[PDB]
Ligand binder design. Sequence first.
Ligand SMILES: [Zn+2]
Length: 257
Amino acid sequence: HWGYGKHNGPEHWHKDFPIAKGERQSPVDIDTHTAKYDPSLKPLSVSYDQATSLRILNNGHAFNVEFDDSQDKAVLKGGPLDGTYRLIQFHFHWGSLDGQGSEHTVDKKKYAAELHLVHWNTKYGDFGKAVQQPDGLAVLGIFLKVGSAKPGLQKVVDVLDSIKTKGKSADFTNFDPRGLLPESLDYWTYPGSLTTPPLLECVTWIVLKEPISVSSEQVLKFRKLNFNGEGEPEELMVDNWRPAQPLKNRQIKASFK
Ligand SMILES: [Zn+2]
């Protein structure tokens, strides 16, 4: 029964998921004055040309756009990574107000939202095995600010009415996730965790420096989603973000000067 409310939000999660207090929890604040350039970090390779989106699902905490991950169709490689990571889904975290919503922060700045493109290491054969490994997942995180619309997000926005409530899904084929990327692939990277229960410490985080812009109308449509099921009391799906966690014995590395 975890969520983002007063009685079941992030400060409670540790009672069912004690790793919430672990050594490699996410998100974190990215201090741009202490992250160090690592000249040996390689450019990211984002290979999404053969991506096959399948479906969009409201899971009660966010919505996931799911992909066919049974072949190497949409993969992330390079950067800090060894091997090949397949895209399984993307989802977002967002706020009730434009001044909050991101999970990672940059010099304590919160963005309006944050996109997570979740990929699993093919050496582990399936997602469920990958999450049990320290190098199982690679998550590409992208900040959203409110400004101009993002044309490549509109197809997502327009389906949200069909998945208003928890457990609803809709067909969602032929969506191109390249339309969600900023111009630059400069990034920060560190080892961390899933940001929702089970909070497993299986993620190489790759957080892009450049945000994307979305319009006020686009974010407003995210805020009409519901945490609840159909025929349950309406609770708007907003503020579905975990705050920054202690960095502990980790270093954040930058791909750029
Ligand atoms: Zn996420």
